[PDB]
């Protein structure tokens, strides 16, 4: 069907870190707000380096620390201001930091 | 305001070697439930406990931990129903990321 029933009232479904911290590409997490949304706070996050951290504790800029995008699926209110009706909408969140070898090409 | 139940329209509106390129590389697995939508989540699983060095090699100091995020699905309430949900918070891996170990002895 297009229009379904949603309960809103979350149930948590086995729910029971420093890696931001600990991690050789940390990161810090930003707050994202929109009234017109469910979620309406999505907590993104952004890299500290553009580097990666070595064994010795400094930024290796031989390395790259990239943040993780994963594509979310949130309710936007349909119409605007809404309280009880949405439509999906598919967006981008970066939800933590990795660190890559750089992708090497040389000026064409 | 804060209704109980509410109306979604499912037709969404839109608004990568990381993987493989990452110290803490990961693989990725389909879970599938069709008693859930999005009825396929695809959770990242590390491929080493160390992580990747400088020469290719693993190294054993260091640790490839996931990612966990804590994710909303629909879970069909009462079961089977193809019109009705609830809302259900879950733990999903969505990638890998090298740490520096934590270290104690215990008592
Ligand atoms: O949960 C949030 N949104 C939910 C959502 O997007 N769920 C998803 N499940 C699997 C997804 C695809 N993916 C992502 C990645 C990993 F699962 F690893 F993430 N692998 C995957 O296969 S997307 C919505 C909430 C509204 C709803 F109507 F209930 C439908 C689902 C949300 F908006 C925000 C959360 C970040 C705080």
Redesign the interface.
Known sequence: ???????????????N???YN????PWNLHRNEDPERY?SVIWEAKCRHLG?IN?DGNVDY??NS?P?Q?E??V??R?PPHS?????????LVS???????P?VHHVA
């Open positions: 069907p297009r229009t379904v029933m949603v309960n809103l009232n979350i149930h948590n479904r086995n729910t870190s420093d890696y600990r991690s050789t590409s979620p990666c064994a031989h390395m990239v993780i994963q979310i699926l309710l936007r349909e309280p009880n009706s949405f439509r999906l909408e598919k967006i939800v933590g930091c990795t660190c890559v070898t992708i």
